[PDB]
Design a protein around this ligand. Structure first.
Ligand SMILES: *C(=O)[C@H]([C@@H](C)O)[C@@]1(C)CC(S[C@@H]2CN[C@H](C(=O)N(C)C)C2)=C(C(=O)O)N1
Length: 246
């Protein structure tokens, strides 16, 4: 009789990241309980720049302080953008789905450094330090946040428990919807900071199950320029399936 290697979801998810030859963690929160998965669990309590995940908080602050509204159409004023898909007029929510950086740079400048720093400190997001450069503090420092802090934040958002108005949180949630099927909903925001070394990749969001239960996640991994962006989505979905969250 041979031996049999018995793979639990802990071992499986650890090896998912190994198979991509990189280091990553998947933080899960539900019912105020946090579990860690992946091949680099020490990432969960390490600070990284939030990159594009900061758009979630940018939108909350901008809407709460009435610097924009969900129907405002941000005009493309004619500069060559990083993607052709961004070269159009669009709402804050369409810019969330596209991760259209220039719309969120415009919003950040409307909020202004003073109000932005006070709101970020009031929320206590990450190390809550934004420095003096209002249009890139979430990409090249000094703002940093751990994956555990990101799952705590996004779970509060999902439960409309952040210290913002309930309507503002509901509207930002709606901007983050990624897929709906068979009574499940998945919400989230990807991120990829390429200008720092090592590069950091994010996918933070939550699942709403058919009975209404919320299971939040924050995936955080080291990126390399050769990877497809979808490597984060593939790792998340395979892991959520292994965990029977979907
Ligand atoms: C957000 O994290 C990031 C902002 C900070 O630029 C943003 C909008 C870019 C990307 S992908 C990025 C663009 N060019 C590289 C690329 O496509 N490859 C494959 C090298 C990486 C994202 C994202 O989350 O995918 N968000």
């Amino acid at each position: 009789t041979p031996s049999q290697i018995v793979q639990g979801h802990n071992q499986v998810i650890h090896q998912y990241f190994d198979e991509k030859n990189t280091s990553g963690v998947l933080v899960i929160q539900t019912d105020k309980k946090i579990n860690l998965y992946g091949n680099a669990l020490s990432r969960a309590n390490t600070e990284y720049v939030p990159a594009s995940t900061f758009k979630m908080l940018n939108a909350l602050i901008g809407l709460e302080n009435q610097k924009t509204d969900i129907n405002e159409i941000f005009k493309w004023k004619g500069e060559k953008r990083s993607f052709t898909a961004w070269e159009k007029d669009m709402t804050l929510g369409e810019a969330m789905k596209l991760s259209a950086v220039p719309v969120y740079q415009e919003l950040a400048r409307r909020i202004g450094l003073d109000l932005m720093q006070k709101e970020v400190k009031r929320i206590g997001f990450g190390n809550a330090e934004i420095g003096q450069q209002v249009d890139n503090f979430w990409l090249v420092g000094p703002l940093k946040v751990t994956p555990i802090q990101e799952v705590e934040f996004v779970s509060q958002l999902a439960h409309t428990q952040l210290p913002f108005s309930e309507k503002v949180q509901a509207n930002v949630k709606n901007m983050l919807l990624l897929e709906e099927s068979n009574g499940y909903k998945i919400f989230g925001k990807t991120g990829w900071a390429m200008d720092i070394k090592p590069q950091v990749g994010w996918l933070t969001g939550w699942v709403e199950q058919p009975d209404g239960k919320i299971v939040a996640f924050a995936l955080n991994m080291e990126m390399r320029s050769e990877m497809p962006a979808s490597i984060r989505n593939e790792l998340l979905m395979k892991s959520l399936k292994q965990l029977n969250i979907i």
